[PDB]
């Protein structure tokens, strides 16, 4: 959702007449006013660069799971979880879980 919001808003004033020396002596007028009374303003860098690089590539998924037919081979069961599947899980479709221990819960239907 990015339709537009554009603005014509200006035509740049290209007056390269006597304005050129007129603006230059005005910049001299700020060299008495800016650096001699008060100036301090700053902002911080590299905050927005920081959050990008520690990213995933280990995205967990529930099992209503969309999966590209390209990424069938790069998905991995949780070996730290005990419940392992039955068929070699490298191709999309339907497989069954080999439920190991005890205390099965968390069924969901809308």
């Amino acid at each position: 959702e990015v339709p537009k919001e554009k603005e014509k808003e200006k035509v740049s004033t290209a007056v390269l007449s006597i304005t050129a020396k007129a603006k230059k002596k005005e910049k001299e007028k700020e060299k008495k006013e800016e650096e001699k009374m008060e100036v301090d303003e700053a902002e911080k860098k590299e905050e927005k660069e920081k959050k990008k690089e520690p990213e995933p590539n280990f995205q967990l998924l529930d099992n209503p799971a969309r999966v590209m037919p390209a990424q069938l081979k790069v998905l991995t069961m949780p070996e730290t979880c005990r419940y392992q599947p039955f068929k070699p899980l490298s191709i999309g479709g339907i497989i069954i879980l080999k439920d190991t221990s005890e205390d099965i819960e968390e069924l969901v239907e809308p």
């Binding site: 004033t13 007056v15 007449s17 006597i18 304005t19 007129a22």
Partner: protein, 111 residues
Amino acid sequence: PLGLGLNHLGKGEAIEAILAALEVVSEPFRSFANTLVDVCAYAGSGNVLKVQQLLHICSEHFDSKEKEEDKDKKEKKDKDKKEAPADMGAHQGVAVLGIALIAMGEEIGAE
């Protein structure tokens, strides 16, 4: 605001604009007075850099009936600073205001 500019007529020092416009820092229907004491100090000389800010800031904008008085009064101050470079700019003034105004304009021209 007119007697203000009559009290500060005829000096191209541009301190009187720093005096008056920073004094009546206010809503834009009171900033109609911004153009008055600015150019009432600007009776006659060549200060063409003022004449471009006399055009470029409020030029047209199509302006559906809000500040239409201000562009008229901005044009009102274009009328002087034109009546005494001794006809050097009077030919240029009739060249501009005949063309891009009444022959290319709106409430600014035809009112």
